[PDB]
Design a protein around this ligand. Structure first.
Ligand SMILES: CCCCCCCCCCCO[C@@H]1O[C@H](CO)[C@@H](O[C@H]2O[C@H](CO)[C@@H](O)[C@H](O)[C@H]2O)[C@H](O)[C@H]1O
Lengths: 93, 431
């Protein structure tokens, strides 16, 4: 095989991370666990994580844009109505 | 000529060996590490070492005696070795240590010095003995929160918290006549021992029965002790096996003999009639491996341990091995079963017909404590020869096929895949 360029990820046995020592991990077989008999109720208080903690970062920008849209839309509707005829001619031409 | 077993209050068991030039007399208790708790874990190991303490050994040596003690999971032993003539001197020492003495061996200076000794001992084992440390962790995760999960040497945490009182509590609760068997092996007659025992009197806690608890349970799981600074990857993997006195005790031992043991550096080892060897030698997947069928009172472990410097191909090592195990359920051949029979017989013969009285003492005491007697090779060999291909397939379909596994590993185990990838290999796709 031809010489290949170094990257930041290797493969199993030489992944390229730092030497690991002192960490011990434990796991239990999925077969020995409760058959997912606790989806709702037990995961409702944890839910809304992407909500309570993230909603403002989404909501504020969304609110800003929605109101900006509604404002401009109401104005356009006014301009093209009978009552808006004078202002239309003013801002259009 | 058939191993005698007599009881007068104290159960005495002997195995006379005319070719033996020495004799071993001792006491085996039906309590081991499996009878301790996470907090007094190591108490038995501490007892073993105070019994082997210099003061106690010097006394024995003056009499021309040698002391031996073994801490196991289900049992515990204390043996004295001597010439066939000095057999009565052994009993006196044994009697002295477990009836007369108490505050002598449990003195402040002896206990502390012994405690410090086992502490450095256990620390070295956990720090350097990788293959055995891994096997101990296999038991720990496989039987977690159950008696069988406790290491026989104890843990550093519980060891450093142990006081003389803890030793006494254990002794009063387990070193009982109802939980013991006095053994006699090597060159000694049963009558010579029984009369020498029946010579003395007393009882020392009579009728007192040992403490009871909850049974061992196997749990599909794993414990990973990754250490990238170590030169190899050491792994132990197993399924729930057979307890002692299980109807499949020998079928399981034979199954393990099929895949056997291997040492890549030994020329003859590479030539064994093991199909797995054809798969693992091409890219040299490991330095060694050994299959086992560990049996205890409440449960057992069937699987293997392996060590390897081929850290990028661990997935192939595990895969090929488990694919071979799959074969026990669907395609194991008659010659594989016949080869296993012959080698199992040799293994048992080497284990039971060893030229060592202390070994015989441990085996004899342990068995008589569990089933009241000791099975002979003659009967064992007969059972082994009766095993068929259908028996192996029936056992494998029950214990191996699509069954949960316990895994333990240390060293460069980055290449050991996730639990589910390993667990999926316990079976094959079928139409
Ligand atoms: C591109 C769209 C086409 C989609 C077609 C869908 C494909 C469905 C394949 C369904 C079943 O394929 C089937 O899978 C099960 C596992 O789930 C296999 O089972 C195998 O593993 C399971 C689980 O460890 C063992 O219990 C079983 O004894 C073993 O044979 C079975 O041998 C195989 O035959």
């Amino acid at each position: 095989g031809p010489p290949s360029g170094k990257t930041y990820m290797g493969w199993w046995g030489h992944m390229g991370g730092p030497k690991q020592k002192g960490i011990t991990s434990y796991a239990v077989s999925p077969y020995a666990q409760k058959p997912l008999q606790g989806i709702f109720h037990n995961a409702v208080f944890n839910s809304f994580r992407r909500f309570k903690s993230q909603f403002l970062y989404v909501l504020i920008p969304a609110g800003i844009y929605w109101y900006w849209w509604k404002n401009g839309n109401e104005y356009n509707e006014f301009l093209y109505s009978k009552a808006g005829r004078e202002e239309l001619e003013r801002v259009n031409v | 000529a058939e191993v005698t077993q007599l009881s007068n209050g104290i159960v005495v068991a002997t195995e006379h060996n005319p070719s033996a030039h020495t004799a071993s007399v001792g006491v085996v208790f039906g309590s081991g590490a499996a009878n301790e708790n996470p907090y007094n874990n190591g108490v038995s190991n501490l007892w073993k070492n105070i019994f082997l303490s210099k003061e106690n050994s010097a006394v024995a040596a003056k009499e021309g005696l040698a002391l031996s003690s073994n801490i196991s999971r289900d049992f515990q032993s204390y043996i004295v070795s001597s010439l066939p003539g000095s057999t009565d001197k052994s009993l006196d020492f044994l009697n002295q240590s477990f009836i007369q003495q108490k505050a002598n061996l449990l003195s402040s200076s002896n206990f502390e010095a012994t405690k410090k000794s086992v502490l450095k001992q256990v620390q070295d084992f956990e720090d350097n003995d990788h293959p055995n440390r891994v096997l101990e962790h296999l038991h720990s995760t496989a039987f977690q929160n159950t008696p069988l999960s406790l290491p026989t040497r104890g843990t550093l945490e519980s060891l450093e918290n142990l006081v003389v009182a803890d030793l006494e509590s254990f002794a009063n609760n387990h070193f009982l006549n109802s939980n013991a068997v006095v053994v006699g092996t090597g060159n000694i007659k049963h009558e010579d021992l029984v009369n020498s025992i029946e010579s003395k009197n007393l009882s020392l806690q009579t009728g007192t029965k040992p403490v009871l608890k909850k049974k061992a349970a196997f749990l599909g799981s794993e414990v990973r002790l990754r250490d990238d600074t170590l030169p190899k990857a050491w792994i132990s993997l197993a399924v729930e096996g057979e307890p002692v006195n299980s109807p499949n005790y020998f079928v399981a031992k034979l199954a393990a003999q099929i895949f056997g043991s291997y040492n890549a550096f030994e020329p003859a080892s590479r030539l064994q009639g093991i199909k797995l060897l054809d798969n693992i030698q091409e890219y040299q997947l490991c330095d060694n491996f050994n299959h086992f069928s560990l049996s205890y009172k409440d449960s057992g472990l069937w699987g293997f341990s392996t060590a390897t410097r081929n850290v990028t191909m661990i997935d192939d090592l595990i895969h090929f091995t488990l694919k071979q195990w799959n074969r026990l359920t669907i395609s194991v051949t008659d010659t594989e079963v016949e080869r296993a029979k012959s080698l199992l017989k040799l293994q048992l013969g080497q284990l039971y017909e060893s030229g060592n009285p202390v070994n015989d003492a441990n085996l004899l005491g342990a068995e008589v404590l569990i089933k009241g007697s000791k099975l002979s090779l003659g009967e064992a060999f007969k059972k082994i020869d009766a095993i068929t291909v259908k028996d192996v397939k029936a056992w494998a379909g029950k214990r191996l096929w699509d069954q949960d596994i316990a895994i333990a590993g240390t060293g460069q185990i980055e290449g050991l895949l996730d639990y589910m990838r390993i667990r999926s290999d316990m079976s094959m796709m079928r139409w």
